[PDB]
Amino acid sequence: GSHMEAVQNRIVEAAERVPGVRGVIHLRARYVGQDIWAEMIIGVDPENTVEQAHEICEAVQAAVCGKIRRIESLHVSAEAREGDTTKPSFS
């Protein structure tokens, strides 16, 4: 599992460094050839507007794609979160 574990760890670490991110709630990734396709859901402040949340999604996309060049496709979106124990995370 190490290849995908390493990729997922790097994605989570990069996303969590972006201000406004409240953990990574969901993450799925696959190799296609030597490239990676991934979809992720970050936690965000519930009081953000959806358009403010999306600015966080865009910042996460930039950070993750910039740091991990094998990623060819990344979809980021958000759900509400807080030390939250009511949703999954990689925290």
57 binds Zn ion (CB under 5 A): yes
- Of 48 and 67, the one with the shorter C-beta distance to its own copies is 48
Q: Report the DSSP beta bridge partners of residue 80.
A: 44
Packed helices 2-16 and 50-67: angle between N→C axes, nearest 10 degrees? 130
Least separation in angstroms between CB 91 and its own copies:
18
Residue 41, number of CB atoms within 10 A of its CB: 20
In angstroms, what is the minimal distance from the CB of 89 to Zn ion? Answer: 10
Tokens, residue 8: 């997922």
| Per-residue binding letters, 66-85, with its own copies (x by CB under 8 A) | -----------xxxx-----
Using CB under 8 A as the binding rule, whether residue 44 contacts its own copies is answered as: yes
> From the list its own copies, Zn ion, none, which binds 44 (C-beta under 5 to 8 Å, kind-based)?
its own copies
Query: Phi first, then psi: what are they for 18, rounded to 5°?
Result: -85, 125
